[PDB]
Amino acid sequence: KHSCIAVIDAGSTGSRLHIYSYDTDDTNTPIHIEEIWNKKIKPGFASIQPNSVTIDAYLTMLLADAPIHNIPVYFYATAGMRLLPQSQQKKYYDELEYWFRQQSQWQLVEAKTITGNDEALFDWLAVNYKLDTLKSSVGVMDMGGASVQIVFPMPKNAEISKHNQVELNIYGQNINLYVHSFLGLGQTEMSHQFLNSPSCFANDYPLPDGESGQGNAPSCKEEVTSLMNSVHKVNQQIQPLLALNPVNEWYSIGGISNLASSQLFHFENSELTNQSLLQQGDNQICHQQWDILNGQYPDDEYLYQYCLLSSYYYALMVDGYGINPNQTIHYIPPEQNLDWTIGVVLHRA
Ligand SMILES: CCN(CC)c1ncnc2c1ncn2[C@@H]1O[C@H](COP(=O)(O)OP(=O)(O)C(Br)(Br)P(=O)(O)O)[C@@H](O)[C@H]1O
């Protein structure tokens, strides 16, 4: 009845199979993309032993019960696998290539670790698809666990790396995008640099070094800005490009959308500003007595991190990207299930 494609998102914490049915319009672009099946397994691919028994157990658990035969499959790993040397990755892909050759139910089209730029492309396509803006300047930011992505329209520029630019034609229109991924600036990886910063945690929160939190979002933001700008040079790379290529609307996916959906934060219309984010983080968490807070919200296991995270998002978007602290940032809410793999259907199916 419809075309079908499978995309496996092999992420740092788990792998997620998505089977989509779609139709194609007369520009040769997928439409009516529907997720018909879904399977999620932990831990991440890069966290299992790369031998046949382990890979077989893992992929069987992921795929065996799929209600669909003879479908093309894309196996796309992201930041978790990017953290591994090429020679380690090879062990996984040798086993995986062999496993798929033993299954005629699944036609492996590609298995690879996509670059963060690739992932930025798919992010942009996925968001703009959900927003129905694709047949129509929309910027997308993905705040992931290990890497962060930014992507916005920008005219082809021969003085910028080809790796940071993508040309595509979508619903009949030629598009050029600037794409950038910062590996290490994802919230989990970045957090590992700041666990002993008392400025980044609720008062009396027990830091690993035996010291106590003493939260202050402006100070915590400054510490994080050092990693963004002194180490990753985010400001130098992104700000001159945004000054010249203004974005009309920002959309964010990933961790922002989770934090903004917490009980401790108040945001309407699935949008926020950096100023409000930082202020609420500073008041509700950074300067808050930890034990009292923890007692009031005992189920939220991300709570302890909200001072750091609010400071980190502001640092990234404001001090890094140069986004105005009062500029509206839309976020796709967690309930909505927007997935970057929708971008792969658009681009590759
Ligand atoms: C009550 C408020 N909740 C609970 C919902 C939350 N509050 C704050 N952060 C949350 C969160 N739930 C999840 N996160 C974090 O969101 C960040 C990025 O999310 P993502 O989903 O975007 O991370 P990602 O990069 O795609 C992942 Br799954 Br780590 P993989 O590499 O593909 O496996 C990750 O680092 C998560 O740890």
Automatic annotation (TrEMBL):
In the record, biological process GO terms are: nucleoside diphosphate catabolic process
Q: Which residues bind AMP 1?
A: S12, T13, R16, G145, Y302
Which residues take part in binding AMP 3? R16, K40, Y302
Highest taxon, organism lineage: Bacteria
The residues that the entry says bind Mg(2+) 4 are Q263
Its keywords, alphabetically, are: Hydrolase, Metal-binding, Nucleotide-binding
Binding residue positions for AMP 2: T13, K40, K42, N258, Y302, Y306
Which of this chain's residues are annotated to bind Mg(2+) 3?
S226, S230
* Binding locations of Mg(2+) 2: F100, Q103, W106
Cysteine-cysteine disulfides = C200-C220, C286-C307
Question: Which residue windows are transmembrane per the record?
Answer: none
Xref: InterPro entries = GDA1_CD39_NTPase
Any one GO cellular component localisation term in the record? membrane
Write out the GO MF terms: metal ion binding; nucleoside diphosphate phosphatase activity; nucleotide binding
Q: What is this protein's name?
A: Ectonucleoside triphosphate diphosphohydrolase I
